[PDB]
Paper text:
Typhoid toxin secretion from the bacterial cell is mediated by a unique transport mechanism that requires the activity of TtsA, a specialized muramidase that facilitates the translocation of typhoid toxin from the cis to the trans side of the peptidoglycan (PG) layer of the bacterial envelope. Entirely consistent with the chimera studies, we found that TtsA is organized in two independent domains: an amino-terminal catalytic domain and a carboxy-terminal substrate-binding domain, separated by a bent helix that forms a hinge between these two domains. To gain insight into the structural bases for substrate specificity, we solved the crystal structures of TtsA and its close homolog Sen1395, which exhibits different specificity.
To gain insight into the mechanisms of TtsA substrate specificity, we solved the atomic structure of Sen1395 to 1.9 Å resolution with an Rwork of 0.20 and an Rfree of 0.24. The crystals belonged to the P1 space group and contained two monomers per asymmetric unit. Despite the very high structural similarity of the two enzymes, notable differences on amino acids located on the surface of the putative substrate-biding groove could be identified. Notably, while the surface of the substrate-binding groove in TtsA is lined by largely uncharged amino acids (Ile116, Gln120, Gln164, Asn166), the equivalent surface in Sen1395 is occupied by several charged amino acids (Asp117, Arg121, Glu165, Asp167). We propose that the charge differences in the substrate-binding domain between TtsA and Sen1395 confer upon these enzymes their different substrate specificity. We found that, unlike TtsA, when expressed in S. Typhi Sen1395 was not enriched at the poles and showed a uniformed distribution around the bacterial surface. Taken together, these results indicate that Sen1395 and TtsA exhibit different PG specificity and that the substrate specificity determinants of both TtsA and Sen1395 are contained within their carboxy-terminal half.
Numbering used by the authors:
A (entry chain A): 11 to 188
B (entry chain B): 10 to 187
The structure:
């Protein structure tokens, strides 16, 4: 599901565009020179390969945030976090999970409230496993709907500020109907 | 989900006059406080409030007053969602969510200009709903209901975080939408 997410971001073609050294720099495979260099790329951006671009994406939006560990407990939750993180930021996505796990812990019966720090840590992963163990697959389904509600309200607010296209948010809701 | 079932579930089969000492509301029957009953022109004893007077008061505050009945002429399903939201959070909270979504989905003002997100359903809000439903069709209505559910779910999160909503309610509310 993550592979599909990144394979859709990395189009069939590099699309090398040379923006100002300051304003983004040269970009290929959606990677700016600045981001590439910060991930140890030293070549010309005209010769950046899809593979190293995918490594940068998997690092920033899957492994760095530790969505791969979430996937160990719930492939579906991790996929939603990953898709959320590429559009809004991985820490925004991680905070949504933490917020929901705190409200659904039954006044701290299942586990104590965690920090909503937006980092997937051992306490976040333990809370997710206890939640999934106590509430079972119905729990997992409830959590996914809840995450979708916080994603959609953030797309609303992004669209109000013009950081997201109307068509994009209409299409995202359309994908979630019956 | 329909309006009659929403009110028929709030009004039980039994009045249950409980005489709170004014502070914690009460005298209350059929979920109606004396304060609300008298503010609706009921002058009898609160012990003798009829179910029918109580239904008239609910219909007044949570269906006609907010103009959800006029919404229902355009979309029975959107009106029923607003009515359910309004009884839990306030009808103007519900009405404002509709205005925000109709503004994002107006295609940069192509279908109709941005309306005031004042939380009051006026002739321009109902005109915008009818144009939206005529341009985007039944798929439009389904999309708008998903979007309204996202803003509802995220407001329940906020309410639960402030302790203004029971965790059980919000889990229950997600589960019924699984």
């Amino acid at each position: 599901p993550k592979d599909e997410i990144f394979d859709e971001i990395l189009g069939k073609e590099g699309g090398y565009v040379n923006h100002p050294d300051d304003k983004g720099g040269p970009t290929k495979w959606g990677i700016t020179e600045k981001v590439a260099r910060a991930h140890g790329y030293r070549g010309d951006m005209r010769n950046l390969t899809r593979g190293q671009a995918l490594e940068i994406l998997e690092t920033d939006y899957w492994y760095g945030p530790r969505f791969d560990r979430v996937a160990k407990a719930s492939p579906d939750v991790a996929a939603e976090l990953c898709d959320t993180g590429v559009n809004m930021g991985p820490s925004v996505a991680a905070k949504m999970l933490q917020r929901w796990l705190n409200v659904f812990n039954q006044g701290g019966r299942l586990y104590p409230d965690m920090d909503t720090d937006g980092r997937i840590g051992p306490r976040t992963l333990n809370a997710l496993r206890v939640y999934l163990e106590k509430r079972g697959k119905d729990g997992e389904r409830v959590l996914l709907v809840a995450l979708n509600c916080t994603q959609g309200e953030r797309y609303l607010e992004l669209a109000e500020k013009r950081e997201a296209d109307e068509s994009f948010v209409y299409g995202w809701m359309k994908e979630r109907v019956l």
